[PDB]
Design a protein around this ligand. Structure first.
Ligand code: AMP
Ligand code: ZN
Ligand code: ZN
Length: 382
């Protein structure tokens, strides 16, 4: 029986957060195994795009999950709480690792990984569920523990686990807040409980483990929110998305007026025609990207007008969705297990490279991807 892979995502864990004495279990795991200095997200540095990149090895511009919120001529609207969009395989390009696993006759079990509620390339994971808010930490850990222990024909080569808590605390209070640290500690402790349970079950020794995040988190101090309608008035363009990556579609005949007001450099953002976006972001070819894309500067939000209003103008907050090269946007990568190196540190690298490593650990043929297989070869024991 081949070694299983447990893939854990801690949404919004910034790379430096392993070095603050608040992750005893993850810090120990890293010392035992492999740790990268950091892992850069892909553009845009948002949750759905990056989680989907992690499991496909494709940049968002290629896999089609180009934002958390999207419009498509045929498929209509997509956003995180729109279940029949999220569950519709036609949005999701490429081949996520669970599809690869199921197509070899092996099985995958996913606790709420973006894309896992659809039948991508026709193939669902063997175990999966609809993402619900506020599931307990123990509930998910105990389910994952169960999935690792299953034997017979329902043995799982791949098991995935996802935590939202650090990201949510980050948004509400900022990455330097006690609330963000409390969340980091809590998720870390939960992961410790999982590891101890795997050891009691005798699954630990035959399971490789990768812990990642999708992006980091930057502070949004009070007064750092504008209206999307300050960028372009609604009569000349529609804001398709708000937050930090702001897509605009000019109204009919208004491309010139929209461009005149939007394009170029502004006080706390910059905007480009999608074909002209900075090449380093490797973004803007996909048809689902709006005609005009603005990037807010680090620490700034642009909100739909009704949100801006109910934004209780008081305390410090947090956001991501900023330039992926920023230190604040840096994510985590660490790994440990029977097939992984011991006591090793890796240079910082791009998140498209994780897929090649996972395909090797899962015994599946690597689908074509945007990563480099050379990057994570040193993470292997041999
Ligand atoms: N598979 C999923 N389906 C729906 N919502 C999710 C899923 N995974 C995470 N989320 C939510 O999306 C938010 C993360 O978005 P972001 O602010 O881009 O990191 C979190 O509050 C999660 O609760
Ligand atoms: Zn996220
Ligand atoms: Zn977030």
């Amino acid at each position: 029986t081949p070694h299983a892979l447990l893939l854990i995502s801690i949404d919004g864990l910034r790379a430096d957060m392993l070095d603050r004495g608040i992750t005893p279990n993850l810090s120990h795991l890293a010392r035992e195994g492999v740790r990268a200095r950091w892992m850069a997200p892909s553009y845009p540095s948002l949750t759905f795009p990056n989680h989907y990149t992690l499991v496909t090895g494709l940049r968002p511009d290629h896999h089609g999950i180009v934002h958390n919120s999207m419009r498509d001529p045929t498929l209509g609207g997509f956003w995180l709480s729109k279940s029949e969009a999220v569950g519709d395989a036609r949005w999701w390009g490429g081949e996520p690792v669970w599809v690869g696993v199921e197509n070899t006759g092996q099985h995958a079990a996913t606790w709420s990984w973006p894309g896992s509620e659809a039948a991508i390339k026709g193939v669902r994971p063997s175990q999966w569920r609809h993402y619900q808010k506020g599931v307990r930490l123990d509930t998910r850990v105990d389910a994952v523990r169960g999935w690792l222990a299953t034997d017979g024909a329902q043995r799982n080569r791949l098991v995935t686990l996802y935590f939202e808590h650090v990201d949510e605390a980050g948004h509400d209070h900022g990455p330097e807040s006690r609330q963000y640290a409390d969340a980091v500690r809590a998720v870390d402790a939960a992961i410790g409980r999982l590891l101890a349970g795997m050891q009691r079950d005798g699954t630990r020794a035959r399971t490789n483990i990768i812990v990642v995040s999708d992006h980091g988190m930057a502070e949004v101090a009070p007064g750092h929110a504008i209206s999307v309608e300050d960028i372009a008035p609604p009569q000349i363009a529609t804001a398709i998305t708000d937050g930090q990556v702001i897509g605009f579609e000019p109204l009919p005949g208004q491309q010139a007026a929209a461009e005149a007001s939007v394009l170029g450099a502004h006080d706390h953002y910059d905007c480009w025609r999608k074909a002209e976006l900075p090449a380093r972001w490797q973004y803007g070819s996909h048809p689902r990207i709006p005609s005009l894309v603005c990037q807010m500067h680090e620490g700034w939000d642009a909100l739909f007008p009704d949100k801006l209003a109910k934004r209780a103008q008081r305390g410090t907050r947090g956001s991501h969705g900023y330039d992926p090269a920023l230190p604040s946007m840096r994510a985590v990568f660490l790994a440990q297990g029977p097939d992984l190196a011991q006591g090793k540190t890796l240079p910082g690298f791009d998140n498209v490279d994780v897929y090649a490593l996972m395909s090797r650990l899962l015994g599946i043929p690597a689908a074509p991807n945007d990563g480099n297989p050379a990057t994570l070869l040193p993470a292997l024991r041999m």
